[PDB]
Design a protein around this ligand. Structure first.
Ligand code: CU
Ligand code: CU
Ligand code: CU
Ligand code: CU
Lengths: 236, 382, 241, 148, 153, 236, 77
């Protein structure tokens, strides 16, 4: 069967979840969601933040544990067909990681961007934030680490060590999480206005470049694919 | 909503908005609402916030629910940034046209070059109607009347769609053939010299020439059409006219000011000297967007927001009329729930515990005099 | 092994489409982060879209990712659309954001918050890379084209917004009227980093001089980001983390 | 630091120890070293141990400076005990304005200065650790130059 | 004026500083106006003689919490004790990892093939113990310094 | 006898000299030593500076000359026991260099630091200076160069060329001497106040990092030690 | 010749020279020519040009064809 419809599920779950989140934040962006210290803002955003943090930590723990415990010990005695199936599964999880990267890094990021040029920042836990750096960022961090662990535990090409470009692609986007609070200091201290081309606002740019390791990731995955299933048909 | 989060002493000592008035409370769509008032530029401007050398008078709303049709500082339109002089009092007047139906919290800030927004007092404004009825007609110097709601939208959308289509066509042309693995294998396995060939080079030349030629003809068309264009208009407008307020006849000296922690009250001692030729009585103490009024002296009629208005929140130990030439020392207590709701009680968390405000003294005749106070604020716990 | 030739081609097609999805969307996310934190403010607002600083800055800080993506894709697959895919992904992200957040969530008009246009520069850069595949030739000529065709390529969109208007006694462009009317609370007017004139600007020189500066610094940025992408495209395996 | 403070600041000059005490860093050092040893991954260290080093600095040093933050009404101005010490014990070469400390901003929201600064320190500590790991790797080389 | 001030060029100010004698000796008391970008501006100075003993000097200050403290020795005990505590923890860690031979045998074991023996049980247990102890001690110290001294500005 | 009590002498001479210098500068820091142009300041500090400069130059010259003339020509025909003795002597001189580095770089440096936050700089030859950059700096420069020459002339491991980390460790701390006057220009011109985190005040930081080559020095000395005297006992 | 190229509003709103007078029209070599006048400093000084906190009164000529023997602002060299 080779590639199976897990790609459809991976696209659909993210699309439905993020569309629901977008509708939720469109409805509740104002009207219990404009004031930082409103009691309704508390019960509408702070509990959401705590719940999403707990759920993402639990999901990361269980995914890492299950996927590292189910590692294939006898990697040498692996049939080429099942190796190709595992390569397809790894590419499906790379699709999930790419989709999560897009949602976390463009839609909700730019989203905060507009959410900023419409009102005036009032806390470091504004609602647009709870949705982006407090939800989508853990989502794609978890997806990237899951893809890394799956490659390590299932693909002999990504065995025998740790791929540097792949590790960079998994960490840099995650490395945007310890900088989520970088600029915020170059703020209550440095940039005392609202901008984007701000210097302090570059700990996400220098590390937005780290996602460029995806191309090294793809070339390594292609080399993994073209081990036994290169042809025959290709190279002729 | 932006306020309540700005530092306490810096909300209280940056700018001072008073004499605020809102033209209407609820307006229909495409209707005009006007905001008037004055703002004394505080003398003790903190160093950490840059001086108002380059400041812009915005209006606080959740997105373009109103359009800032006109804005004046003094009597001069100020579409660009202005230069404000520290210690000077200006009178401003902004004109808004309703654009979206809903109850909106219209504020008023003076954004500063190195400081950021300074949110003033805000009032709820109700707008009824439909967004589809809103119009923004403007007449250019070329003799054409256009609607800014949909002007140039067609051209913008069409041109972005055109260029995106060209890009997608290029991608599709180079993606009809197999993309990644066979091409990588052909490149690695010896010389490829076959992935790009005729007539792919011809197609690339065709698209390069087409892009250059289309851009040139588009420039020519956008210059033949619309032959008159001016650059973006920018530049700080200096020389704003301050208000020529008469020198106050009341001198107030602050001797110790304390606030209970936790508490909703502010306690402060003033030595008031009354010059002029009329008995005065203290009526209002405005600290930061909150008006502490004495109900027995002065009552608000301009419809100031209820959450920011304390009708009896200003209690004076001896509010008897002060004869001219007589100096007395009285205790002034400023207690209201707003003082905690708007987080004026978090100044204890705030590195510079100094305050400032406006004291409004009214005589029997009715006319008032505005005097300023600035003193350290000392928290008390027992 | 694979049973026959046909399903090998089918698997190659599936991998092509799926990896294209992966690379395209990762580029969308990362390049959009880069653009929105290096040229976002100018790209947000039509009044911010001036002829000195917008034209100067946007190509310089925005040619970064196309350089790396070409230096990988062309060199390794003979796929001459690294810049085109970077630009298309960036524009798709910008337009989704503008239409569903700027105009959908808030209500800024599209003709006010439209993004810039970059496809002409991307096409020039990619075709110059493919024809005469020299990377140095690209970094000179194609980078100059990318830096120089930005403003004229974007001119038909913003030219209708430059018609002068006498607005309450002050000379105002339609872009300025839009910025004055549609209030952006977080983006005041003074933050607008646009042309304000100098003692040493000589008539009709701001648009071309800024374009040439953008082309030159784009040459430099392309030259450095070519090697940045070359490093990022490595296939090294670390024996220890 | 302690030899200098006790024999020069307090011995040579007479600045009090409770005024010129140095910072405390052993908690951060211990976290960084144990995170390096357990799960010996240098990248894991540069993330988690660097975050710990950047984050436990202020809370680790809090029991020393907390007694110096008790508010005092000093001649009509609200003053912390550290501020009173700095005002009293005159440092001729170090005037008060040079003091690069918090002075407030329009965009600081209550109790956020301490945690936001800590997280910024943790992040930039991640970056500095990452670069100085390779700096030390280069410095630890055993190369011999055949010519000077 | 305990903090920096802003002076206007061309304006005349009158100043008045109050000093309390702290050390016995003849001292040259000057008067400067330090400037943001210029540095000290030393004014005229006068010799002042102080007689007595340093041990008699007192600096009593009363806080808003109702406590009278002497700034000469306030918090000195806590500061010295806590620095000594953390230095002792560090020295204990160094001593634990220095009881065994340190440099040459360990370097030789690392170079000669895989070591995989220099760190083992229960050294990992000791490292976990010290990490947990450091975190827990810092947390309890924060709690104690907040339960005690509940008001800080 | 292997290691002999030269380490005791090396520690004791430096300790006694620096304690005497500290007592001298504590007594004479004020009271003929506060004023730059006082006639007593001249005869109490300028003659001291000139004498210390002359003595350090003479000591460096004689040490370098004697230690380079007494080089062992027949390095190949060297017994392992005497080679180990020379390695011990080299490590003793490394101890002397480390102690001199500490005294020059922390005690007297921080010392000037306090000497600055107590008065106001008045010359580029203030007394604390005469003691630090004008005395301890030549002391550790001489000790480091002596250790370098001894290693080159006595140890076959440090023969056959020049060790890069060892040369860096010897030069960088010496390289703090040509920067002794670096910041001082970023002063009478740049920094017009008293600080430490000053930018111009980094020509001692970038080059304070050059002392980190000591760890490469120690690993090379350990490799020199483990040539013939590795065991037997070690590696088992 | 340097003028005619400076921005328009900034030539028009920077400084204002009036009451200008030239001592002589044609002079021999080694002869003295004096320029007098006043210049009201404009109030609406544009932000893009720094304030005249540090300004110098030059004289415009194609190279040292004259030597600026003396220059006064007010009555002070
Ligand atoms: Cu930010
Ligand atoms: Cu509001
Ligand atoms: Cu210096
Ligand atoms: Cu001329």
């Amino acid at each position: 069967l080779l590639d199976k419809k897990w790609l459809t599920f991976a696209l659909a779950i993210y699309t439905v979840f993020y569309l629901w989140v977008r509708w939720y934040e469109g409805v509740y962006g104002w009207s219990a969601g404009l004031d930082s210290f409103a009691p309704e803002f508390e019960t509408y955003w702070m509990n959401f933040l705590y719940t999403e943090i707990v759920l993402e930590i639990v999901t990361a723990s269980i995914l890492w544990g299950y996927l590292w415990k189910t590692r294939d010990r006898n990697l040498a005695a692996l049939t080429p067909r099942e190796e190709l199936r595992r390569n397809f599964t790894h590419l499906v999880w790379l699709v999930a990681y790419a989709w999560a990267i897009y949602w976390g890094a463009s839609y909700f990021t730019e989203q905060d961007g507009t959410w900023h040029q419409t009102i005036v920042r009032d806390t470091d836990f504004t609602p647009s934030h709870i949705i982006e750096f407090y939800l989508s960022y853990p989502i794609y961090i978890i997806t990237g680490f899951a893809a890394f662990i799956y490659a390590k535990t299932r693909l002999p090409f990504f065995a025998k060590g740790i791929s540097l470009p792949y590790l960079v692609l998994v960490v840099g986007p995650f490395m945007i999480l310890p900088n989520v609070g970088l600029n915020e200091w170059g703020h209550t201290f440095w940039f005392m206005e609202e901008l984007f081309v701000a210097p302090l606002h570059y700990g996400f740019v220098i590390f937005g470049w780290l996602a460029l390791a995806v191309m090294g990731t793809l070339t390594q995955t292609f080399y993994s694919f073209a081990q036994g299933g290169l042809g025959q048909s290709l190279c002729e | 909503h932006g306020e309540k989060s700005q530092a306490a002493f810096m909300r209280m000592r940056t700018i001072h908005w008073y004499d605020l008035s809102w033209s209407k409370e609820k307006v229909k769509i495409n209707e005009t609402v006007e905001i008037k008032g004055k703002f004394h530029v505080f003398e003790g401007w903190p160093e950490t916030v840059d001086e108002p050398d380059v400041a812009f008078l915005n209006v606080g709303m959740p997105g373009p629910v109103f359009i800032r049709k006109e804005s004046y500082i003094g009597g001069q339109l100020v579409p660009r940034s202005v230069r404000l002089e520290i210690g000077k009092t200006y009178d401003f007047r902004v004109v808004l046209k309703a654009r979206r139906p809903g109850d909106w919290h219209v504020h008023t800030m003076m954004n500063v070059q190195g400081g950021g927004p300074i949110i003033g007092p805000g009032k709820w404004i109700t707008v009824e109607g439909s967004m589809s009825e809103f119009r923004n007609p403007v007449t250019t110097l070329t003799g054409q009347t256009v609607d800014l709601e949909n002007y140039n939208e067609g051209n913008t959308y069409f041109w972005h769609a055109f260029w995106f289509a060209i890009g997608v066509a290029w991608i599709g042309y180079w993606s009809r053939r197999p993309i990644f693995i066979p091409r990588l294998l052909m490149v690695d396995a010896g010389r490829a010299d076959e992935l790009v060939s005729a007539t792919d080079r011809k197609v690339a030349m065709g698209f390069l020439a087409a892009t250059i030629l289309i851009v040139v003809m588009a420039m020519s068309s956008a210059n033949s059409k619309y032959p008159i264009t001016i650059p973006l208009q920018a530049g700080t407008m200096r020389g704003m006219k301050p208000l020529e307020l008469p020198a106050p006849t009341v001198s107030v000296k602050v001797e110790d000011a304390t606030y209970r922690v936790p508490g909703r009250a502010m306690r402060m001692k003033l030595t008031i000297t009354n010059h002029g030729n009329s008995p005065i009585r203290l009526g209002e103490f405005y600290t930061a967007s909150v008006r502490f009024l004495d109900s027995d002296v002065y009552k608000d009629t301009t419809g100031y927001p209820e959450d920011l208005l304390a009708e009896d929140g200003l209690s004076v130990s001896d509010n008897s009329p002060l004869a001219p030439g007589e100096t007395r020392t009285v205790d002034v207590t400023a207690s209201d729930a707003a003082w905690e709701v708007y987080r004026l009680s978090d100044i204890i968390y705030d590195p510079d515990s100094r305050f400032a405000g406006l004291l409004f003294f009214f005589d029997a005749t009715g006319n008032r005099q505005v005097v300023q106070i600035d003193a350290p604020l000392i928290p008390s716990f027992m | 092994a694979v049973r026959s030739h046909a399903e090998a081609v089918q698997v190659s097609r599936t991998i092509d489409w799926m990896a294209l999805f992966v690379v395209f969307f990762v580029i969308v996310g990362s390049y959009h982060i880069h653009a929105m934190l290096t040229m976002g403010d100018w790209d947000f607002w039509s009044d911010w879209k001036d002829r000195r600083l917008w034209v100067t800055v946007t190509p310089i800080v925005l040619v970064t990712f196309p350089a790396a993506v070409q230096s990988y894709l062309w060199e390794r697959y003979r796929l001459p659309w690294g810049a085109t895919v970077c630009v298309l992904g960036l524009l798709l992200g910008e337009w989704i954001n503008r239409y569903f957040n700027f105009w959908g969530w808030t209500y800024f008009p599209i003709n006010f918050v439209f993004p810039a246009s970059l496809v002409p520069g991307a096409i020039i850069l990619d075709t110059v890379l493919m024809l005469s595949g020299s990377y140095l030739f690209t970094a000179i000529v194609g980078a100059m084209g990318w830096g120089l065709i930005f403003y004229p390529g974007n001119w038909p969109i913003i030219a209708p917004l430059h018609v002068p208007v006498e607005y309450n006694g002050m000379l105002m462009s339609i872009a300025d009227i839009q910025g004055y009317n549609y209030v952006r609370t977080g983006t005041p007017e003074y933050i607008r980093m646009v042309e304000k004139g100098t003692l040493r600007t000589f008539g009709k020189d701001v648009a071309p001089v800024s374009a040439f500066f953008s082309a030159f610094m784009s040459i430099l940025i392309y030259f450095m980001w070519h090697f940045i992408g070359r490093w990022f495209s490595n296939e090294r395996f670390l024996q220890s983390t």
